[PDB]
Structure formats: C-alpha cells, structure tokens
Subunit: 86 residues, 3 copies
C-alpha cells in the first residue's frame, strides 16, 4: 500500500535514470559521428554513399530526438500522476 | 485506484518509449560502425586487431539484439497484463 | 491485486532489460571510439580539437557510467521493494 507507492516512486525514478542515460549516450553518438565525419571528409571525401549516410544519420538522429521529447513529456506526466497518489 | 491504473499505463507507455529510443540508437550505432569500417578498410586494412574489433562489435551487437527481443516480448506481456487490470 | 503484483514484476523486469541494453550499447560506443581513435591517431594526429573531442568523450562516458551505477542501485532497491510486497 505505502509499500506500493514507494515501489512506484522507485520505478518512476528508474525511468528518469534510464532516460538520462539514453540522452548522454545520444551525445556520445553525435561526438562519434563528428569524428567519423572529420576523417571521412579528410580521407574519403567524396560524396554519394556518404550523402546517403549523412541523411540516414540525420533521419535516425531526429527520431531519437522526437522519442526523447516524447519520453520527457511522458516522464513529467508520470511524475505528476505519482504525486497525486493517495 | 483509477489513479493507480493511469500511472501504471503511463509507466508502461514510458517503457515502450525508451525501448523505441534504444532501438533507434542501435541503428545509429550500426551506421557509425559502417562509416568506421569504410575508413578502416580503406586507410588501415589490414587485419588482426581489426578482426578482434569486428568480432567484438558482432558479439555486442548480438547481445543488444537479444536484449531488444527479450524487451519486446516483455513489453507485450506487460501491455497484456495492464489491459487485464480491474 | 495479484494482477497488480504480476504487472509490477513485469515492469521491474523490463527496467532490468533496458538497463542491460543500455550497458551493452555503452560497450559498443566505446568500441567505436577505439576505432575512430585508431584512425584519427594514424591519419590526422594531431592534437587540439581532438583533445577537446577526447575530453568530451571522457566527460560523457563518465556521466553514463555514473548514471548506470545509479540505475543499478535503483534497480536493486526496486527489486527489494517488489519482493516485500504483500
């Protein structure tokens, strides 16, 4: 009962934790993309398949962004709902 | 009570969100591996430590895959169980 | 009721699953950083912006680590709390 609330609070906290981890990993991913681009641009050039790659990176980066936004909104909703619990 | 159900529904939705985010990040990871392979193959060759790297990438990619599969199954189970709630 | 416990157990299991996935992806990330470093060191050298990059990678890697540690602790707490449920 009170046991239930504490558990729920712990699970909601845990979702915040995991969201935070995925966010930091997204920044790591973008840092790796930067490094690869610095090498590809310098070593390879040249265009074409790398244009495919660039757009593919962009597409997936944007879906992660949208997912993280949706997850942020859901997190605040969940935290609000947790706080209204009897 | 009904408050509890809404919270639970929100937490389950949140797990789906995070699963989706991790899936998209996995695709980003594979895109970065592709780019690194394109450079390594071209610049470095050559074999050996990069064979270690390739198998290491494969091993970890496979555990993520298996984890995502297990997570998908768990998600459907959770969603089924949520729906059976009184 | 018992329905509630099973759901909660499923959600806690699901958090463990996602934590595991993020952990494996972190190892993949470090493997990609290794490969990029092997190319940058060989092709580019040279220092400076790559020193920025190295510290940036380090900073974010450390926050993921700390987040994963915090998430591990939260997971054990949640699992303990789940087990004390009536």
């Amino acid at each position: 009962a009170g046991a239930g609330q504490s558990n729920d609070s712990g699970i909601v906290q845990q979702q915040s934790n995991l969201l935070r981890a995925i966010e930091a990993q997204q920044h790591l991913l973008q840092l790796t993309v930067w490094g690869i681009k610095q090498l590809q641009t310098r070593v390879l050039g040249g265009g074409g398949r790398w244009m495919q790659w660039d757009k593919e990176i962009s597409n997936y980066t944007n879906t992660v962004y949208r997912l993280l936004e949706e997850s942020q909104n859901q997190q605040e909703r969940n935290e609000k709902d947790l706080l209204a619990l009897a």
